[PDB]
Assembly symmetry: D2
Homo-oligomer: 330 residues x 4
């Protein structure tokens, strides 16, 4: 004799990947997570899983053809979860996706049923992975993945408000003429309509915007900054109306989370976690609070000093999620 044997002397046979990531779901969200992770050099092996065989194969092939331009030496796919074995991180993006003029909460029951199949299969092949839930409604689906998986809470992470906070910092950046990296502010709670802008922590160079505008984010705000949060809430609905779905910003947000996990950064992110007994909540609700994310998932939660209104809004967000959650079948 063979040309390979005439060219190369083999001295060694077949080891497990060391930094493998799996993306479940090859829809627009899943492929944007896949491309973003590949372009960030986070994995030595990427595995893709879906139920639509041709689509899955074509997407994997399209990725593989770009191998020369990447540093991920193994791109694999299958409808069979055996392909996901030895993953450090498993990203779930599968299910019904948010529709034009409809809440993400409208996808709940269908995605719970789909997770009843996915989660045990993922768990069977990578019992020590970190689960990263992207599918909507993300906060409810994270709690669901947590209950089905049997994993300790640190290993079940929801993409949550990482994107809402990025959109908020972009918008704040545009108003101020400052790069989003230099605009600080957190959007917590539900990754959806009941999200909470923490105006009290919004700052540039440590300068509290609330200190220069006491009314910041209220109805009395002469600059109507609440409209920036309105823009955050509405963003997915506007993007879906224009292009039919959202993909790029979420793919970049998920890769940002994957980077913190894969490289054990211990950076703080506003991501879905169990808040039972934290803030003002007594229900087994998952929602975004600032978390320290690293190699073991969520190891710590930052306790944000919320104003009485911010606390009320966060309790309201938890209630809206518990309200939907309590009535589900699983």
């Amino acid at each position: 004799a063979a040309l390979k044997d005439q060219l190369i002397v083999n001295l060694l046979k077949e080891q497990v990947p060391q930094n493998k990531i799996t993306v479940v779901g090859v829809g627009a969200v899943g492929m944007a997570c896949a491309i973003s992770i590949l372009m960030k050099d986070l994995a030595d092996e990427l595995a893709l899983v879906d139920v639509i065989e041709d689509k899955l194969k074509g997407e994997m092939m399209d990725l593989q053809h770009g191998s020369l331009f990447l540093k991920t030496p193994k791109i694999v796919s299958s409808k069979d979860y055996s392909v996901t074995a030895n993953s450090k991180l498993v990203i779930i993006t599968a299910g019904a996706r948010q529709q034009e003029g409809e809440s993400r909460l409208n996808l709940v029951q269908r995605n719970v049923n789909i997770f009843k199949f996915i989660i045990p299969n993922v768990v069977k092949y990578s019992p020590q992975c970190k689960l990263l839930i992207v599918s909507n409604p993300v906060d409810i689906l994270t709690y669901v993945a947590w209950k089905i998986s049997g994993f300790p809470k640190n290993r079940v992470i929801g993409s949550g408000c990482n994107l809402d906070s990025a959109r908020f910092r972009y918008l704040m950046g545009e108003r101020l003429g400052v790069h989003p990296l230099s605009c600080h502010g957190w959007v917590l709670g539900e990754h959806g309509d009941s999200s909470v802008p923490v105006w009290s922590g919004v700052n540039v160079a440590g300068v509290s915007l609330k200190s220069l505008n006491p009314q910041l984010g209220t109805d009395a705000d002469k600059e109507q900054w609440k409209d920036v949060h309105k823009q955050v809430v509405d963003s997915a609905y506007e993007v879906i109306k224009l292009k039919g779905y959202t993909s790029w910003a979420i793919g970049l947000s998920v890769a940002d989370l994957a980077e913190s996990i894969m490289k054990n950064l211990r950076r703080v992110h506003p991501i879905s976690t169990m808040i039972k007994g934290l803030y003002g909540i007594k229900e087994d609700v998952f929602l975004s609070v600032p978390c320290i994310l690293g190699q073991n998932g969520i190891s710590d939660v930052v306790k944000v000093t919320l104003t009485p209104d911010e606390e009320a809004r966060l309790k309201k967000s938890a209630d809206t999620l518990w309200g939907i959650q309590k009535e589900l079948q699983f």
Copy 2:
């Protein structure tokens, strides 16, 4: 105002220094955009299309990921004034080939689209290089060249950069070597008449043809010609499976944009005018290894081809020249 209480303006201002425009927000256009953004090649990105909603939606979706990027300005419009001061304009607009349809069948539809696009792009960007991605790429690079009236160094077709990348990936798979360490060139038409240059196929300077002179021929026990057949069929296989191709071409285009933006002077198999080489006496555009930098193609590598490889290259040139003779400007 809150901005004035927080920030003192000290300076009243300037032209983008490393601007890139992507024409077409279809799957190819959007994969080029995400790839370019994730490689930090531009200080400004402009998007152009004819479908207003889709264009705004794509622009907004990219803008929302700005925190995770290093491209501080992302803009879009149907109006080409948005593309002003681009150093590189990437054209991905036009009809795409169906299963069983040759890229050469897209000619009349895409030339008519280029008749509008090309004069509008060149208008606002004196310093731009035109990078053609739309198909048939070789023919459309000649069309972009004729319409723009640009010098040949400035008009580039993505050509066989992806064909050679695919060939390199497939060779790597057979050998258990990364594509980076698998060398091989696929030249000519980015289509059915492409030419695998078996004479230059190597690992660590070792010629695979020197080890097997039957390499790439029907006599080949390992049927290495099937690797070139797979390169030829690749777009069609992917189209049949997922409906279109996007990721690999996006990465191939960002690779070329990187060499241009960073004046790397790397060698790529890309569409250029070959009048004067291999006995070609006409204004044919096709892929040959080109040195690519800040002024586009400044130099062309003269690949030494065996008589059969040269014959296959002239056959690809005749095929492309025949289609050029059908062009109605």
Copy 3:
């Protein structure tokens, strides 16, 4: 010729680089700036300038030998400033450096004299460049470069407290078990002993560390956070005692500033600029305040809300610097 047998030339190009960076001084600081800039792909051309011919050629050849692993296609050097022609950014690291125990202010006259030769030469070949001053005392030498160059203030930037602040965030990160990227705090004023930690702006996820500890950074602080600022001030002296100089952290700090300029990022950095008009400063004092940094240099200044003690400390830093800069011989 072999080159011509292998290659057909199409045109004689205008070889003028688009993103050229010059590093003046090939000492330990200059070379650390050089390697960090090459490893960040910020430049299409890197030029080195020094007065020691052998060391200059040696440093240039060594960086050139690594070209295969880089994306900076031209690395050049000369004692002649003609080699610096058409630079977008010129980083000055040349001059005397602190000996063990030596104040950065002690380098003032020697460095002002060196700058009298350097600055006109830089200006001669790159009249549109942004000047980035790293040589010490940085604040005073930024004033010197400004006066000599005749450039508008936006294009004359001092590395200032970019590193002091990075050290502060690192130390804060170590105390809290959080990545420095998620620890926020600003060290302002002189890049030296009179620097000011802004305790009011020190936070993790927008939670003011002082709101949890009212006595944060004071003598009454049970946890003695003031020692974090003392460690910041002492850092270079401690590193100098141990390794004889500092290099890596300043190199990374300078490339961070180079990145904001070259890529027009408009990020906020605590760097040396004229503060005439802020905190009751009526003179041409250059010192670190948070600045928006982009392609045109310092376009804007963030007005930080200082406590009366913080403002008094900043005005003391301002007076220490003005005492020296007002009497300079040039």
Copy 4:
């Protein structure tokens, strides 16, 4: 309570996954450290040396740069317990060549130092690959392999990775092509007896020797042998000018660290056992093109050398064995 506990609720009661250790904090060691840090290859970086102050100072200077990096833990100690669980251990410690001194002259000093270093590395990092940088690299890779008890694939010498990068840079400068697009292999000893493989020197698959048969001989009108002479002389000239070399070796080591950490299976000219190849009968380690990945060197490419190139390679092996056979450890 404490401020930390007022700010943070701990919910989880710490072993690195991609740790790298650099042994020796001289100019080579620190160039390796910064290059690795800037390539984001490790989640933990450990430094080891015998000079306490110097080690502490270097560690501290790296830590102070943590904000600009993605390596969340930088540690150091004289004690090898600090290197626990490394996936890669880079050895740069030992005597370095003076002006006018061969790397081969450092052998006794460096073999004696390796007797202490190698068993302490292996004791705390049983899963690691050993990357030898200290000189003479080829002999020290053999020595580290023998001492360690590690299989030969896990004991790699930086070898000719830098010699080949130097050759590719010089070739690029002569041709006006980026080194990435200039292919050429310098094999054998990382020293005076290195072998430029002229037969494999090519641009885009075009052999330079096919265009110029005299390539690399004294008859060559363009004197391309001066390129290999500059490669051989490079460390001596740089040492004569600046007192040592650091930047190019640092980047060459980070290149090898990348292929290892990311299991790339790229081809590099690095130190491995050549017994059984080109009729070499002894346990000589020298550079040949190797496939490098997560398990180190898994495969060796068999370069087809001309009679003179093969004679030069066997002469390099003979030189190395001349020094190696007289070693006591």
